[PDB]
């Protein structure tokens, strides 16, 4: 009797792309305040 | 600077002959694994059957006969080949004995 690797999940594409989009929001709005 | 004063890794003085570094490629040689790769020399799917036959040689005659065409399906229902068929579910001791019976046993319709 042998156990395989237990199921583990990493960062998906959807959530990482959402974080990328958010990063663009706070890298887009602040320079308007500077300007 | 300071180069030879550190000794925390494999260095040029740890191996016996400093000139062995000239070759320095024998470390990166994959030695042929024991059994099935011997089949590629003749060739210069077949290797797996060869390894299967080699490991199949360790049977008794009656045991080999039973496993000669043996196929096991996923749900546990078992198919037995008569050299009739004995399709029955596994993990019950009786079916196997029955398979042995009509294998080596004597059956005669006698008109």
């Amino acid at each position: 009797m042998i156990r395989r690797a237990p199921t583990t999940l990493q960062l998906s594409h959807d959530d990482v792309t959402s974080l990328i989009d958010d990063l663009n929001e706070q890298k887009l709005k602040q320079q308007l305040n500077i300007e | 600077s300071s180069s030879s004063y550190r000794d925390s890794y494999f260095q040029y003085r740890h191996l016996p002959a400093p000139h062995h570094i000239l070759y320095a490629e024998w470390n990166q040689d994959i030695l042929a694994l024991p059994d099935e790769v011997a089949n590629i020399t003749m060739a210069m799917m077949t290797s797996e059957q060869n390894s299967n036959r080699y490991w199949n040689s360790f049977h008794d005659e009656d045991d080999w006969n039973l496993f000669n065409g043996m196929e096991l399906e996923s749900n546990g229902v078992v198919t037995f080949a008569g050299q009739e068929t004995i399709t029955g579910s596994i993990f019950d001791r009786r079916i196997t004995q029955l398979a042995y019976a009509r294998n080596n046993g004597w059956h005669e319709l006698a008109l």
Partner: protein, 213 residues
């Protein structure tokens, strides 16, 4: 009374208060002459395998196999520990040695099949798990490995039936229920996976695998 109590307690199942078993076998080791007997080292091997102390697997198993080369009580744990360590050469020697002596027993063919397993030969090792299962019923190792051969590479549909057979024919073990639930999870079907996981947790309360799942 005390020596027989310890002797029986050696063989109890793990996952529950293993410290008590450790203390009992330590008491049995020094006080009495039973210091390095077969069952005490077998219990140590079972303990290390449960806690994945695979190094101790190999030392204790080698130190016991050097006396008895064919002790069937320890061979399953020994094979699992070596498979985890992927000692291909040692496994080939063991498989060959058991092939010349015990062709009938399912342990030999399970060993040969896991030798194929370690070389990534799932499709071929399928047949050899089938042979090991046929030669000896009521053997969790053979059928569970056979289900692993189904589940590892494609053909997902009937791995479900294989694991259901494992659960029904081998009641009382949380492992088949856990495997079936995880496979349903692999299908992205959720409620059934949760149901099988809670079933496995019911069978076994203390197991990192089931709680992680």
């Amino acid at each position: 009374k005390e020596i027989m109590k310890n002797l029986y307690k050696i063989n109890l199942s793990k996952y529950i208060n293993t410290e008590d078993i450790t203390k009992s076998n330590e008491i049995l080791a020094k006080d009495y002459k039973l210091a390095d007997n077969v069952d005490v080292v077998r219990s140590k091997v079972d303990i290390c395998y449960t806690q994945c102390k695979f190094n101790e697997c190999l030392e204790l198993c080698e130190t016991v196999l050097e006396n008895d080369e064919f002790n069937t009580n320890i061979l399953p744990a020994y094979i699992g520990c070596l498979y985890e360590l992927s000692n291909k050469n040692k496994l080939f020697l063991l498989s060959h040695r058991l092939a010349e002596t015990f062709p009938k027993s399912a342990i030999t063919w399970f060993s040969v099949a896991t030798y194929y397993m370690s070389l990534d030969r799932i499709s071929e090792a399928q047949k050899y798990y089938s042979k090991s299962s046929i030669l000896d019923p009521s053997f969790a190792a053979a059928w569970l490995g056979f289900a692993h051969t189904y589940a590892l590479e494609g053909e997902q549909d009937q791995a479900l039936t294989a694991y259901s057979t494992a659960s029904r024919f081998f009641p009382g073990m949380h492992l088949p229920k856990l495997f079936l639930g995880m496979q349903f999870m692999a299908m992205n079907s959720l409620n059934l996976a949760e149901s099988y996981f809670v079933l496995a947790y019911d069978i076994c309360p203390n197991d990192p695998l089931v709680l992680n799942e």
